[PDB]
């Protein structure tokens, strides 16, 4: 059994492969120097004690001329001083590695934790298919092409920076294909990811779990109606939040509260929540914030999207969706990050139009658009036609409504499956979204939702 | 256990397996019938087969309970593992013997070359600049040699772990394969067995050349599929490929 299948190890050893060789090259050409220490150095060092063999045996040991044989003897010794001192250096080079790895692992470890809920958001909605390459596109633009590294050389300033520009980019080109209420959902889970990936913080796998789960478990023997403004229910939640410790005492804190009223009917009272949870030391920013979300969990279920927002916000960095609310600019999307195979999949809502975009798009790149609708079956020949004469010279071909005929999209997903010759040719399929469009062909696409 | 005990000792009997100044350890019981109460270097070897074949079971056993995703375990797999075994530790070691009689036959020529210039000193400048780079290469043909013997020792452990990695570790994970080969390290550790200490093994088991020819021939760089190219080169039951993508084939 020979396995090639990807798996979480898997993409870790690969990243940690891929920044070793970007952000310490050096370090990286240690590790090919100790590797080469086993195999090739000792090897050439034979080949070319055998190159010293042949030339004492062509010169006959001559004397006259003595810097032939001299200087290819001061090769070989200088040869076996070098692999002399990288052996001598072996405990040290390999501990300064595992120095160096052992810095790089969180990156690695968060980057097949976003991969694979990236490849698991196929639960949520069928729209959501994405492939290893588009992941690892990601990784290329966010190590090399990043303009947050320009200046930076540190090494310690570069290792946050990447880590913040990868989750940024990571939320960025994943939500431009992704519902709108879905934008809280990844934007939680990214979240979790990041608070798993800091230092110093606890994981709060209880308060999580109750927060997802724990508010339904069996309580409704003691269910108790406190005080008149706590309604029935929201003692009930009032109960499963006092199985949690933090919580325990909220009956007798809200008992205490003489405000706890007018903040139950404040109408944004996630901006300020009265202090319940009981705990000796004052928790960062983070449980701070878990614990108001549980608080709100409790009292005010409405305003719970405003503090998974706020939640958010405080974890990943304020603004951290800011880049959603700012309208969709498509141009620098076209015109690099996405390569010629890659097929623009226009996604829209059934009931909207999406072709004026990509039509607004092409008269501000002052570039020529073959539109063709799918419809007709000349529709099909002439859609074929205008692809095979596109590529030839980079005519953006842009079909529409193509969610009506399936097998030709499979058909059209196993020609762009081919190269393509002209780079500047772009190809973009408006579609609805309807769950029979082809899975093969969403996974090979950027999809992007309207 | 007894069986396979049995059956690797007697396909290790051909293999030169024997080590007079081993030490031999404490605890390392695996096979509950061992023929002396302190094991021989052959016998440790097989016994450390054998554990090999029961972790493998093990490992299975956890990867069933933990998931599911299991694979069974036949004595066709033993079978391959020492077949592997065998025929590794021979390359091995007739590589490194011919290599040492390489470095003799050089030393000899380089005395030759010293005979032929003491009989034309009988310029002297150059002479000097001769004699001591001779006995600079002297010296380091010398280590070379003693390398050589040190080499050799390490030559069972390090092809033990090497081909059970060939044979065994397949469609396992890197995070299991690492694990089951740091079990079988440990393992060795525990039975006195001098294998090379963090033996890397691509390089080990394959060349530059190897790797060159794979790398333009599309396959990618991690340490998965540099691993996986070496079992498709190193096959003797013929390769099964669980490839999602079409890169393997």
Redesign the interface.
Known sequence: ??????????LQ??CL?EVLKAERPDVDEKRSDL??L???FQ?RL?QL??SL?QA??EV??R??D?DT??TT??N??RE?AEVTRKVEETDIV?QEVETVSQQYLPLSTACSSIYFTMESLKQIHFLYQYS?QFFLDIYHNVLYENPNLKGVTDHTQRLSIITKDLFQVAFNRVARGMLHQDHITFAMLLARIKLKGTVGEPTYDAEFQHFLRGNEIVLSAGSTPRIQGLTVEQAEAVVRLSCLPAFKDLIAKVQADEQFGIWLDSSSPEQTVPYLWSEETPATPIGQAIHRLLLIQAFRPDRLLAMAHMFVSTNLGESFMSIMEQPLDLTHIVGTEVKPNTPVLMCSVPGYDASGHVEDLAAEQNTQITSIAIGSAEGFNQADKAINTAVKSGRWVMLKNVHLAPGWLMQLEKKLHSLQPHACFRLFLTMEINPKVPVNLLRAGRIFVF | TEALYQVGKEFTSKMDLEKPNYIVPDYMPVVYDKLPQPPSHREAIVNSCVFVHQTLHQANARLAKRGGRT?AITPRHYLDFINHYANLFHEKRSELEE?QM?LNV?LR??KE?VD??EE??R?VN??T??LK?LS??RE?WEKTSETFKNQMSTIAGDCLLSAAFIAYA??????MR?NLFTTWSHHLQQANIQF?T???R???LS??DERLRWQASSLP?????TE?AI??KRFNRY???????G??T
């Open positions: 059994f020979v396995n090639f299948t990807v798996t979480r190890s898997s050893s690969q492969n590797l080469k086993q195999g090739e090897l034979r004690e055998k063999l004492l045996n006959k040991g004397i006259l003595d044989i001299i003897l001061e070989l010794k076996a390999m290893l | 694979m290599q390489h050089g020529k380089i070359t032929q210039v034309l000193r310029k150059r002479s600049a001769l780079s600079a290469e380091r397949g469609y396992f994970d890197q995070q690492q090379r963090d033996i890397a691509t390089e080990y060349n530059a760089a991690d340490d998965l599929c996986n079992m498709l390769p099964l490929i669980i490839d999602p993508s890169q393997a």
